[PDB]
């Protein structure tokens, strides 16, 4: 499956980073979502064509080994939610989710 930190604490204004780890992340592509409590998930990082870094706007992500770092630039107090990395298997048969990671804002 996937591997995440359970919760990440940071003050506003700094740069919070979340490391989604897992065995399928050797090869496959990683999603990202945002879900407010009591409401729907929101796709936050999608992808373009393959050699195009997906998309770089307000967030970014790098890759090193089986770890994928979720860079959050410019933390404020309004983005408080729970976050999720998503991928599939290298065999391309089924789709799994991350464990879930709470944003803790000071």
């Amino acid at each position: 499956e996937l591997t995440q930190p359970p919760s990440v604490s940071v003050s506003p204004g700094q740069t919070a980073r979340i490391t989604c780890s897992g065995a399928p992340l050797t090869s496959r592509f990683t999603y990202w979502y945002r879900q407010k409590p009591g409401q729907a998930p929101v796709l936050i990082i999608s992808r373009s064509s393959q050699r195009s870094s997906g998309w770089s706007g307000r967030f970014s992500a790098s890759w090193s080994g089986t770890t994928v770092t979720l860079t959050i630039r410019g933390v404020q107090a309004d983005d408080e939610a729970d976050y999720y990395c998503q991928s599939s298997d290298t065999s391309d048969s089924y789709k799994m989710f991350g464990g879930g990671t709470k944003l803790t804002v000071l």
């Binding site: 979502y33 998930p41 064509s49 048969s93 789709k95």
Partner: protein
Amino acid sequence: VQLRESGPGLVKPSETLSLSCTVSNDSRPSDHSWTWVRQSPGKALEWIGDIHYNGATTYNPSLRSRVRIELDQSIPRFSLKMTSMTAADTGMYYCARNAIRIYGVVALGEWFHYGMDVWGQGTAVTVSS
């Protein structure tokens, strides 16, 4: 693009499940993917299955023995057939559109998933008596 779910609210245990999700304001409804994903309270998300308008479906293999997803395309509303409801499946369930864009021949796999852009209403799936 609009979407709305459809649910009964209260379901007894050991019975079945009939859900659907109606889609409107979609200029190309025919070339996306359509999926059910559920959520338990205070838990992670939980993918269920998916359907494409060719008729090809995949499922979560652990849940595969009790589920089925089917489709009407005239009314852009795809259904949901879960059997054998248990109280552990009490949660918040979602329909969603997983978009795919095309960079060439569809039959040769020159496409990629855009990502799941549009998320459903959510329904308080209550398995109780």
